[PDB]
Chain A
Amino acid sequence: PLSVFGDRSTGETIRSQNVMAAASIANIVKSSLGPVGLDKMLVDDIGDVTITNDGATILKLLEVEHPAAKVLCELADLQDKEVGDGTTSVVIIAAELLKNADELVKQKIHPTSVISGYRLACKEAVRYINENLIVNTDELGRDCLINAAKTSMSSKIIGINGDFFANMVVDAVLAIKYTDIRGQPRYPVNSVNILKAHGRSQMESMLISGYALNCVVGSQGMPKRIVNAKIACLDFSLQKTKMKLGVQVVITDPEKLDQIRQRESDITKERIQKILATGANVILTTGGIDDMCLKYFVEAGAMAVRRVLKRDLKRIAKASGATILSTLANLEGEETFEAAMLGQAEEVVQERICDDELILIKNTKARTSASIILRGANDFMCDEMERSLHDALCVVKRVLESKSVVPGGGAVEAALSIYLENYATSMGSREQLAIAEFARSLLVIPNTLAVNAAQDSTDLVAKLRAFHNEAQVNPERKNLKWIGLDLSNGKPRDNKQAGVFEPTIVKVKSLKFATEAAITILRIDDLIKLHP
């Protein structure tokens, strides 16, 4: 009848198939949630090994061919990009929402009603979080940032070492603070260079009070330590001058050939001398330097670095007050380099880190920068440490930008579930059921946390729900909103007192994104798959 060259699935079949795909994706990463979560080891069929706990990384490395599972994978990626934390939680929440919504649909509830109920429940959950479950960081201080970083680094390879790593993260984040127009303090994370080098234990990871370059000096004749550095940042190669494509040398009188050939290098010699005459000590260029200019720098006792990465050069110039110079050409048509275009630093060295060397620009002036050198046991450990450190940096950035945090350890989900279960009775007749199922789906996070610890999930979650119900019913027992899960003892605990914090934006964005994904998938009721 249709005569379409492909396969078709319609009705309960396609809905159940989509639910199965989403559930499989959720089950892939469900075991890496919470402090008692465990990492995974991915082998990339050519021997490459990736050991990670981050949900986004696991979902990107996996190759998936079911489009709903692809939707969840891109959901995790979006949560990573926009927030940086909660990548596993959003996937799990979306999958549970899809499961419960599909159960409602199988109960002959129209999917439009389920979608409307989910939208209302998400709006009310965000409103309730913003109105009741937020804690201002003004009355906490640096301890709040430390606790947020420690909570973020739980369930990571650096979790036990939080007492040290949280201090490192907070110092690094505060060291790059800059205020823009409108007086808004913004923290440009990803300006903190993360360098990985195996060797000593994690305790020997260093926080550079400056910038760290994964580069060395181009010539062994140059000094490897300069005290009062005058950094000159350039964006052009220092090589023998070659004329452009449109210029061709034609010789009729041979007497000029030697002059031509000599000028070919004298041009670059003059440029080097002009740069050096201003007292420059360190020269960084994104382009290459040939042996001639390297010797020019050697004779002057000046450090010269070639093939510097553009982002590293930009960060160094911004921190040290230097200016990138793609060319030496002023507005008078001449070719000059003035000393005002030079950055400064208190020391530039080339240190040795486990049989290799890297350049440290210590204590730059006119702006403070930061870099972190992570020391591990092997490459995989250092990579996972870098991923966890990035998660912590993003969490600290979110906390410092928006000064609201919410209690962790499943407290928010339990409070939201109780509130939404109560609130659904005042809305609609079938969207009532949809909101109730949204509330029930929100409880998957504490259940997974308890299960990962091999604890009594049913009783522990029941006690959490009882505590939050008492908090929401008795007006004078509102201090129980902070009661979450203490996985070490398997007992409810005041997580706000215990210092288990996390940014509000994580929960808000995760809820919004999960609702979007569940609505998108739940809308499908027919699939046509054309043969390739």
Chain B
Amino acid sequence: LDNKCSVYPLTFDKNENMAAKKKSVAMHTNYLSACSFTNSDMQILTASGDGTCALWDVESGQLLQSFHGHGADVLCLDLAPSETGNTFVSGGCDKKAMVWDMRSGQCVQAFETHDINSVRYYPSGDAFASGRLYDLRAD
């Protein structure tokens, strides 16, 4: 009744064409708010209901950094313009959008003028959609 989806592509039955390496970490369980794959496929960013953004490595499988500081759970997050040290935004239920940097593991910038759920970087990277538009060069 409520599910009607238990038979989902979980089977992933193919002829072993090199795509079977889906990893599917799912160690932290809880809620996978955003399983976005980094432009560099080395790393995975995941957000949970506790409000902490988690960075995982596909090869080792270990939790690199847990990004905490959001007031509420992070509903959405994005990636860097191309790689740029993966300076990623994180939009949650706390009406606040902030940027994190693994080279330091800190909230480099923050914005509060709006829950944000449709973050998207500008192609240049100087701004990002805040479904508004926040300018990196002017904060």
Contact between A and B in the complex (any CB pair below 8 Å): no
Interface residues of B (CB under 8 A from A): none
Interface residues of A (CB under 8 A from B): none
